[PDB]
């Protein structure tokens, strides 16, 4: 995805916020710049894009930078973004969370009982040139019993899990 990123000069963050912009910042071991976008813009992109897939910003002057969102802030009262730090990608192997998908239907319907997405998406060390969309979860043979975690994922090439490994990434439990 992509969206204009107009250079932030450096004046009245609220002025923006209120006006229509959305303060942000892009950086890496090299770059570090003040940016701003547009609610409707950022929203329309993130809402679906989030921070799982790559975002490329269109700076007013040619520039086309490959990035991701490391963190966004909220105004507690009525969730609405306040700031955003953009990670200007390059080539060095980088960390990042990748989505997971739980397909099928593990035993848990006769008496009920529903799973519990214990870690929607996980971080795994990988080189940008390769960035899996989402990963699969072959779980469907476990009832109220145990759960899977850590190295129980067909983590493709360059997917050296970057966690413990031990992080319970899913679990099925009783109803009400």
């Amino acid at each position: 995805y992509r969206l204009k990123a107009y250079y932030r000069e450096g004046e009245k963050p609220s002025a923006l916020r209120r006006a229509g912009k959305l303060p942000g910042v892009m950086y890496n071991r090299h770059l570090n710049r003040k940016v701003y976008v547009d609610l409707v813009e950022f929203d329309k992109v993130f809402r679906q894009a989030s921070i799982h897939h790559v975002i490329v910003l269109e700076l007013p002057d040619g520039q086309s930078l490959p990035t991701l969102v490391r963190q966004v802030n909220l105004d507690k009262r009525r969730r609405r973004p306040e700031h955003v730090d953009f990670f200007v990608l390059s080539d060095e192997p980088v960390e990042m969370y990748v989505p997971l998908r739980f397909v099928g239907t593990p035993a848990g319907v006769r008496a009920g009982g529903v799973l519990q997405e214990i870690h929607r998406d996980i971080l795994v060390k990988v080189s940008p040139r390769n960035i899996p969309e989402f990963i699969e979860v072959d779980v469907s043979g476990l009832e109220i019993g145990d759960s899977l975690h850590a190295s129980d994922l067909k983590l493709p090439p360059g997917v050296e899990l970057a966690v413990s490994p031990e992080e319970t990434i899913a679990a099925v439990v009783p109803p009400e």
Binding site: Q71, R78, M96, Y97, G112, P175, E176
Partner: protein, 136 residues
């Protein structure tokens, strides 16, 4: 169920802690106004929660009482109140996410929480997700 207690009333300023994010569950119930929520209330809500969709999914109650609410016996003045009597409560600043459901349809989920709100002595708002996280 511990520590040395019968504490100071204290007050609820801005809700700098009134606004988390769905942590587990799928949908949720965020608070709009600040207040003290009596355990009596939590349950009275949670119960109706589960009870709304008998044999359903899971309910998560992120808020939790621990503040002792004292009260006098119907007399005058002479040392802190018998205290507790009725019990304890939790402090909610506008924005905190009190309850959150999961493992169910939105038609079932959403409508479920709506009821809860009636139990709580505040004004509420319902949320979905896909928002905040720490991914890239």
């Amino acid at each position: 169920r511990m520590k040395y207690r019968k504490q100071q009333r204290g007050r609820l300023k801005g809700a700098t802690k009134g606004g988390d994010y769905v942590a587990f569950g799928d949908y949720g119930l965020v608070a709009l106004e600040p207040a003290w929520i009596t355990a009596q209330q939590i349950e009275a809500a949670r119960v109706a929660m589960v009870r709304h969709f008998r044999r359903g999914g899971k309910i998560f109650i992120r808020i939790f009482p621990d503040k002792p609410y004292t009260k006098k016996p119907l007399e005058v003045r002479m040392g802190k109140g018998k205290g507790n009597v009725e019990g304890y409560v939790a402090v909610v600043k506008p924005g905190r996410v009190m309850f959150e459901v999961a493992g169910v349809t939105e038609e079932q989920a959403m409508e479920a929480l709506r009821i809860a709100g009636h139990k709580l002595p505040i004004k509420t708002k319902i949320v979905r997700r896909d928002a905040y996280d720490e991914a890239q």
